[PDB]
Amino acid sequence: NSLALSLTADQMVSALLDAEPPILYSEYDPTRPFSEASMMGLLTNLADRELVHMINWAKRVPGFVDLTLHDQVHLLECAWLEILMIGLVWRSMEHPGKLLFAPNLLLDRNQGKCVEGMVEIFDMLLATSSRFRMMNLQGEEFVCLKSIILLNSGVYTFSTLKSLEEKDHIHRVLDKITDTLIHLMAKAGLTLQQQHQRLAQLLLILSHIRHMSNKGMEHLYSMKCKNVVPLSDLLLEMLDAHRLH
């Protein structure tokens, strides 16, 4: 069985808030100027350290441990960059025009230019951060959305009756997160019509986050194939799961 379906909305929120990964610092060295390689090195080293915490976090998302290790691997393989990005956009909300990759690595788009091909991704991330700011996205809504990404992004890339039963479990958990989002909006006093309008506005942003992740994956693949930076063995495997051209 699954204990995630019997969780209330408040218990869902509390579980997800306590599961939140820490904010990590980058290995930024202020003694040397930026190059394309050294900035790509900072960003990939930070992502690699965040991945370890992401895995711990995913195991605390209700319903995730109920899955086989193969299904867990697949979901994290599909969603990891979306998850890093929605976290980055969340962290940057109160920094208009800047991306807070880390507290000691707060960059504007002009600093992003030193990595060619990143400035388009940079601009999209800023636009997403500004959208969340204009919407006044709350922390409890943010953790719901991040968990939806983890459960949703790989769900539609799974014949056997046990596989259709595990996909049904994932969709039952996603429905619980929907109930939780609606519960949070009603508790904040939004009218019934405002609740479904805001739920739609938030979920449509996930398509832009999917878009940004795909563009980011192609950029990371380019940096690997041009020998710009060495990728950790974990980052190479997370990249190879997307099978780019």
Partner: peptide, 11 residues
């Protein structure tokens, strides 16, 4: 024996 599969077990 990929890295992600191993990290998902250690805790």
């Amino acid at each position: 024996h990929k890295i992600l599969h191993r990290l998902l077990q250690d805790s």
